[PDB]
Design a protein around this ligand. Structure first.
Ligand SMILES: O=C1C[C@@H](C(=O)O)NC(=O)N1
Ligand SMILES: O=C1C[C@@H](C(=O)O)NC(=O)N1
Ligand SMILES: [Zn+2]
Ligand SMILES: [Zn+2]
Ligand SMILES: [Zn+2]
Ligand SMILES: [Zn+2]
Ligand SMILES: [Zn+2]
Ligand SMILES: [Zn+2]
Ligand SMILES: [Zn+2]
Ligand SMILES: [Zn+2]
Lengths: 362, 362
């Protein structure tokens, strides 16, 4: 007996196109999403070129329209040069992404004043998300308060961070956050097995106490999102390993396992992979869209999942209970039992749908 | 220039059918909803007969299907006799309503043990909402914790209540709440004008300090809902005034006025009249459904709004800025500028839609 879920949304994926298509492209990354029970993705802007201006966004939009197999929105990236220049295209993006710790030189901000400039100039009704680790969470929260608006904190990974966000919420501040599966299901205890190359990710894997704090503070977590960050095994195992894990195909099986063990409820899962993504990012419903999962099937994660071009996974060897059996996207069978059945280009930019524009005052 | 909003949801309305149709019926109450920019309502079970068993729910469902002009879900009501008897029909209802203070004899619970019995027997994945005032909020929160599930608190009206819920949320407890417009826009200061009959409502009007606490603690409020409780003027002004105010036609104009004054944002409003109702009650999207509002039009609330059979309003004389101009429901023009244009019976029970079933484990 299968369980029907709504179309799940992953608000944090790196699909590598343009410019890193050996790691992933729109067609392969969205196949991975569908196989993971995800029907809508928000793609990050740290591509090559990065999505930091209108011409780059226009290119990326067409590449996604031609390659995506599920629906999507594309983030714009903040740079040291583009504050005050994005107003005409801002509403066509998923939101604005700030990279406040390590990142590409093009996305590096060298001063908190540049963060303030972005918060002041980006349209106040549109989402802002920040990669902000440790004290950077508190710093960007300060900037958000100074500019009197909200912020969403990406991939919270530490006890320190979840407790700071908890304290901010207790003071009524408009902050939301997401947590990625590797920070719930992996820890320092796994670095022996992974090694220092495969294990490289930002935010880094936490201690057992960090992991336990995130579970204990599940009420504080608004969203789950994969931070799908595909790199090939050659890159992960080489001399200058880039940070990041692939995660689209494993996120839902890992979380369904946790549901089956009573660690969180099915509703808790659906708030975090459907309702809260919708409401934080003003993402539209998808008509005639659902995911059917089998909650009894026990399997072991293999050395690579079928679809992501990353061709490796840090969850290799973990036993899961829960599998995606069928995905229907806008009335078409998109995935059944290991086969993707919609072509590249089936997916659409949800920000172009009438219901996908963010409401604003005239 | 109009603003397009999604279809708004009111999770707390009394539509009086069956048995009180001189006060309101499905056709008139849903006309009032459409004129207020509401496209989906959840109707309470304190009708005559009350919706406390499967035959009563079946009757109410058919009356609503025949009379409703917007979409709906119907609550079941907890009684002293029905715990453990509602499992076959529970998933067809909006949720279970507990009346924990004053109410009809049929819905009166005489012991907290009866509350526990309902929390233990009602399916754990389905919503429970409680009319719970003052210390009753703390009591029902205790019952929810003892039974390890969530609860939604109706019409929070007092500083005491919002601060208790605030403290519960700070401890990570699964509680949500709603606030009605009369508790944000009226206070004791208005009882002189209203008089003791018209002014009767439960929860009663608060002090200025209660009102100010609700605004200061807007972050704690998950939903707005009208508690549309129509009674005729003869009843409100007579010897045994029933509590309650009509509110469907005035809720959105009052709140749009507050948005225009900067008291909350458009997003704050839409979280509370759209996204959070959806996610707390697992209500489905409505395809091709939107509301167009004019934010510049200043008007004064008259002695009665056009549609509710209550034929009076406690907001008479208040100046508002904001008006509903057009509602489209599932591809049909449902309301324009003072005229409802869909007939009785256009509305549908959203719990019968495939996307309107609450997900559950097998
Ligand atoms: O911040 C980031 C970005 C990401 C990437 O590879 O794009 N991978 C990571 O591990 N952290
Ligand atoms: O609890 C309630 C119910 C309602 C009604 O009239 O049905 N009116 C009120 O004022 N409070
Ligand atoms: Zn990041
Ligand atoms: Zn993120
Ligand atoms: Zn990322
Ligand atoms: Zn929205
Ligand atoms: Zn009530
Ligand atoms: Zn209620
Ligand atoms: Zn009520
Ligand atoms: Zn739901």
């Amino acid at each position: 007996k299968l369980v029907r879920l709504p179309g799940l949304i992953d608000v944090h994926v790196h699909l590598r196109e343009p410019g890193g298509t050996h790691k992933e492209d729109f067609a392969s990354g969205t196949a991975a999403a569908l196989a993971g029970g995800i029907t809508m993705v928000c793609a990050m802007p740290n591509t090559r070129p990065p999505i930091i201006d209108a011409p780059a966004l226009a290119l990326a939009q067409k590449l996604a329209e031609a390659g995506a197999r599920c629906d999507f929105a594309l983030f714009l990236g903040a740079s040291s040069e583009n504050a005050g220049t994005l107003g005409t295209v801002a509403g066509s993006a998923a939101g604005l992404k700030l990279y406040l710790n390590e990142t590409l030189s093009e996305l590096r901000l060298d001063s908190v004043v540049q963060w303030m400039e972005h918060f002041e100039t980006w349209p106040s009704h549109l989402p802002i998300v920040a990669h902000a680790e440790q004290q950077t969470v508190a710093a960007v929260l300060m900037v958000a308060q100074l500019t009197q608006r909200s912020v969403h904190i990406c991939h919270v990974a530490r006890k320190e961070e979840i407790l700071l966000i908890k304290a901010a919420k207790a003071r009524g501040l408009p902050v939301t956050c997401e947590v990625a599966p590797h920070h719930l299901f992996l820890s320092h205890d796994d670095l022996e097995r992974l090694g220092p190359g495969k294990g490289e990710v930002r935010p880094e894997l936490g201690s057992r106490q960090d992991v336990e704090a995130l579970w204990e503070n599940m009420a504080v977590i608004d969203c789950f999102a994969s931070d799908h960050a595909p790199h090939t095994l050659e890159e992960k195992c080489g001399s200058r390993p880039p940070p990041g894990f692939p995660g689209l195909e494993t996120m839902l099986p890992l979380l369904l396992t946790a549901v089956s063990e009573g660690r969180l409820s099915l509703d808790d899962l659906l708030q975090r992979l459907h309702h809260n993504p919708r409401r934080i990012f003003h993402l539209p419903p998808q008509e005639d869209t659902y995911v059917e999962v089998d909650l009894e099937h026990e399997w072991t994660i293999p050395s690579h999942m079928p679809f992501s071009k990353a061709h490796w996974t840090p969850f290799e060897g973990q036993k899961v209970k829960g599998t995606v059996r069928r995905v229907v996207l806008r009335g078409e069978v998109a995935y059944i039992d290991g086969q993707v059945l919609v072509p590249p280009g089936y997916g659409q930019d949800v920000r172009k749908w009438p219901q996908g524009a963010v409401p604003q005052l005239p």
